[PDB]
Design a protein around this ligand. Structure first.
Ligand code: ADP
Ligand code: ADP
Ligand code: MG
Ligand code: MG
Lengths: 118, 74, 371, 160, 371
């Protein structure tokens, strides 16, 4: 067992993890763009008469109310879920690491070499 | 209370407190710009909703991790 | 998808997916806010512990049941209990599951309407249905007739049924149940010196009642025996030591069921309200009801009740009829097992109150054809 | 292999002060810098530095195996700086949890040896004695048949 | 910036920056004016030597503690002590550092208000916070429950805590502490011929108490043994020679803790006020308090007290409960270590009493939400 490759292994793991995270972020962005385009169709603005825009904006406003209801729903859901998740994270913390927060220390430092100066 | 205030808030958000908009009452360029605003608002908000879905995924993962830890430790 | 068979009850919330044998999560229905001040910072102290979590921190809480006698008296706490049940004990979002609540007979309408309004607006279920707690207990026994005495913890009700046709004019609902027995036991324990007052110590008295009390076959003989010998005195260790010895309080606590005059109630015991409920039925179905008397609910788990009740009814009933008392070993969860069976039926699949129907008629839909 | 050795190649005066103090405690001048590993640990504990016996025993089992007691300066300085804690917070806990959930696709509340080894071979590092079964031996403290994110920390905590 | 965790105490002032393991400067809290005339001119004789300087010139001073029993009786001297602590033992101006004082439970309000007024007007700190001396000692043990007996030098108090929720109705504060033990030892030494009277010789008696006295496991057996053999007589050399021999005064001085009738106090010992403090708590958290009894404070450093106290409580408590007494080796500085931990927390960073808040509500702000 060599202490040599610990640094290389951990740095390589960090590189792999960063690559995976940025790849996941990019694919999430692509999926979000595709889902938005398939949920809110792009605006058509070519040669439309006044009544064409009237009707299109009416449809868009109906969709606006619909999606506003959808997203206030998912927003309340995300608020409740985030609150609950934070609460359970705090619960797990107090369950496991509550005995360790006091152990968070920067000790045995100044008094180790401040004895015979008196 | 039970939640009657909460449901009243929900209804107000969905119907009243939403960006209640009169749209089909504007000039050609004005109606066009308002439609552009509505379309952009829908786009940004749908992106936000996808983000909320992804956060639901992450919260589910955390729940699974916490459950496995609890079952292993208790 | 699968249906959620929840069963609010009063004292223990029992829930689980339809089609199983036993409820998945069973936990007391209590919501207790902390009452002291709290000095440690960052301990992560919540504002209300619900369910089984508040039965472990009950030393510094003030537990309060949100359901008094079948009816629901504190809607916010009940909503909190339901939210906990759905999200933490089953971990299934309610947006994708039908629900089948249960309700005692002869309850106020507003309670049922508020229940359905909550389930449809807050939790936003696809479809929910409310069923009477006794028909399910009759399902679980695999019968189709019989008169079921469902002595829960909140309220004791006695619904007779024949050939699937319920008799609405013969339901005898009595409000003596397990909670009043707990209070009476806590009140008669003071005759030896043990004083339990705090709402947390009511749980300790409940545990004493569950583990020690039993129903006497003959009351006077037991009272005479316990007053001469000492073969009955069973001891029990409190949550801190100091064992206690229960004498003739053992069979005096559950005797209140057959003599409600002990706690000052006027009405007759559970041994005579069953006979009265039978006698209100027609003259030609009394033999079948006599032969198929069903027991259910938690409070009917006292050791020796299925014999005392049979002796009492045989004393009351005509000498020719045969009196039989069905007491399945799975008494406590009988209502929920029946609920699972009912939710698993194909014929029942079109009786749910679909959400579009609620949107068209409001919460008053529950009293309509979709009962 | 490379971090502490390169830091030796680019030695800073902060660590150089302690290096010279230990050397003058050991070497009084015009010497080969032998510094026996037993004396090395004794003085490392002696000079007010971190008194961790585990690193001293590892060095004793590792160095002066020639029977001469001489320690090469490269390994001497490497073990000196590695007795001191050289890590930058081991990255972020939430960040590392996200890294591992990207790693862990099963998402059963833990991760098994398979995902860990797949990521290990994705890293692209050589295999030595501390491979193969050192990971199994170290991660199997309670031997739960898995190496979760917490178990992965338990194996090689302070990942940089 | 960093916070100053001062801890006034009564007998030893312990201070240091937040986030370390041990206080930076620990020195007795005594201010002694010279009492003789003084004939050398230009010797540079000051008018009051405070802190550890007056423990070296104590031969010609009249030392007087500015804190009697937790409360502060001489505000000018206490201000002088604080000024010395800030400027000479730490050398950090208070204009750039928050402070975290500590105070015994059940102390007069005026003491706390005057303390905050001094800290905000004279030293002009940015923000100060006052904390109860027992919660910190519970922090240092890394627990979150437990009943802590903090037997300092001024006052012994016994604060029970569960799950971070302090129980204000179960705090039992007793005014017997190290100083009364010093006086009683000085009073029983006269039975062999050694008379210590001067306020300077009280320090010598304190040193005797620290170095020789120990708590007997069983009092009567030790009294019988010391009266027959001579294996206990330990000698000690005064600051000028003339060694003295302490016989059964060794375990009779600290025995006053468990029998306060020796110094004429009515109350029960520290072995029985802990049990009484537990019994006032609720019936469901008594097991946890029994299992997590914590000792702190200087006076609990007597060799053999963690066994005598456990034996006494086991005698009092029910036989089933397990009695465990936590006695960390760093007992003396336990309160200050806990103070450092509390000041180093991020969640606590917004609880300080900011100066603008004091300017708006006056010194009575301390009793308000910012406790
Ligand atoms: N084994 C038992 N022996 C005696 N009484 C019991 C037993 N189990 C439960 N009980 C009583 O029954 C009550 C639980 O009844 P339960 O059937 O859960 O009511 P619900 O109808 O509200 O679900 C408890 O409060 C308790 O007093
Ligand atoms: N090693 C010891 N053995 C016995 N008694 C001690 C010892 N150290 C201190 N004491 C006693 O404790 C007192 C110091 O208590 P301390 O915890 O400093 O009080 P405070 O709570 O005011 O800081 C001294 O007066 C002394 O009588
Ligand atoms: Mg029931
Ligand atoms: Mg103290």
């Amino acid at each position: 067992i060599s202490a040599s490759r610990k640094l290389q292994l951990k740095t390589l793991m960090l590189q792999i993890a960063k690559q995976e995270m940025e790849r996941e972020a990019e694919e999430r962005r692509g999926e979000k763009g595709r889902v938005l385009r398939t949920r809110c169709q792009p605006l058509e603005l070519d040669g439309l008469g006044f009544e064409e825009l009237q009707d299109l904006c009416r449809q868009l406003h109906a969709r606006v109310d619909k999606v506003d209801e959808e997203r206030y729903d998912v927003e309340a859901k995300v608020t409740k879920n985030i609150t609950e998740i934070a609460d359970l994270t705090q619960k797990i913390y107090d369950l496991r690491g509550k005995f360790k927060r006091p152990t968070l220390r920067r000790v045995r430092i100044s008094a180790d070499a401040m004895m015979q100066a008196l | 209370g039970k939640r009657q205030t909460e449901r009243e808030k929900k209804k107000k958000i969905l119907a009243e407190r939403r960006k209640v908009l009169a749209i089909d009452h504007l000039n050609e360029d004005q109606l066009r710009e308002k439609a552009k605003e509505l379309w952009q608002s829908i786009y940004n908000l749908e992106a936000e909703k996808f983000d909320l879905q992804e956060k639901f995924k992450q919260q589910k993962y955390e729940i699974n991790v916490l459950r496995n830890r609890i079952n292993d430790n208790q | 998808t699968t249906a959620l068979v929840c069963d609010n009850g009063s004292g223990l919330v029992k829930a689980g997916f339809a089609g199983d044998d036993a409820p998945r999560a069973v936990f007391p229905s209590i919501v207790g806010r902390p009452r002291h001040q709290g000095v440690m910072v960052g301990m992560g102290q919540k504002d209300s512990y619900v369910g089984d979590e508040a039965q472990s921190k009950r030393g510094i809480l003030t537990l309060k049941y949100p359901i008094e006698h079948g009816i629901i008296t504190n809607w916010d706490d009940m909503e909190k209990i339901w939210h906990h049940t759905f999200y933490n004990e089953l971990r299934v979002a309610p947006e994708e599951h039908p629900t089948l609540l249960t309700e005692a007979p002869l309850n106020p309408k507003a309670n049922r309407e508020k229940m359905t309004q909550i389930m449809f607006e807050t939790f936003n279920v696809p479809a929910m249905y409310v069923a009477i707690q006794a028909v399910l207990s009759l399902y679980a026994s695999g019968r189709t007739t019989g008169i079921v005495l469902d002595s829960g913890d909140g309220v004791t009700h006695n619904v007779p049924i024949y050939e699937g046709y319920a008799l609405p004019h013969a339901i005898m609902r009595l409000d003596l149940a397990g909670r009043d027995l707990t209070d009476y036991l806590m009140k008669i324990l003071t005759e030896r010196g043990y004083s339990f007052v705090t709402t947390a110590e009511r749980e300790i008295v409940r545990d004493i009642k569950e583990k020690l009390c039993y129903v006497a076959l003959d009351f006077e003989n037991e009272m005479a025996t316990a007053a001469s010998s000492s073969s009955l005195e069973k001891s029990y260790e409190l949550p801190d030591g100091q064992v206690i010895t229960i004498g003739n309080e053992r069979f005096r606590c559950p005797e209140t069921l057959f003599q409600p005059s002990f706690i000052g109630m006027e009405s007759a015991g559970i041994h005579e309200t069953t006979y009265n409920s039978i006698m209100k039925c027609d003259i030609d179905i009394r033999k079948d009801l006599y032969a198929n008397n069903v027991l259910s609910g938690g409070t009917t788990m006292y050791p020796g009740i299925a014999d005392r009740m049979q002796k009492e009814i045989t004393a009351l009933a005509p000498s020719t009829m045969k009196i039989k008392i069905i007491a399945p070993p799975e008494r406590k969860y009988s209502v929920w097992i029946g609920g699972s069976i009912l939710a698993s039926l194909s014929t029942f699949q079109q009786m749910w109150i679909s959400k579009q129907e609620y949107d068209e008629a409001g919460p008053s839909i529950v009293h309509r054809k979709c009962f | 292999d490379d971090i502490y050795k390169a830091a030796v190649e680019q030695l800073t005066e902060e660590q150089k002060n302690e290096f010279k103090a230990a050397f003058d405690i050991f070497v009084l001048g015009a010497e080969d810098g032998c510094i026996s590993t037993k004396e090395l640990g004794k003085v490392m504990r002696m000079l007010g530095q971190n008194p961790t016996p585990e690193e001293l025993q590892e060095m004793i089992d590792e160095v002066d195996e020639d029977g001469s007691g001489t320690v090469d300066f490269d390994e001497f300085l490497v073990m000196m700086v590695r007795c001191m804690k050289d890590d930058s917070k081991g990255k972020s806990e939430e960040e590392l949890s996200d890294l591992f959930r990207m790693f862990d696709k099963n998402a059963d509340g833990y991760i098994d040896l398979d995902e860990l080894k797949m990521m290990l071979q994705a890293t692209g590092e050589t295999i030595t004695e501390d491979d193969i079964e050192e990971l199994m031996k170290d991660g199997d403290k309670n031997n739960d048949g898995r190496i979760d994110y917490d178990e992965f920390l338990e194996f090689m905590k302070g990942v940089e």
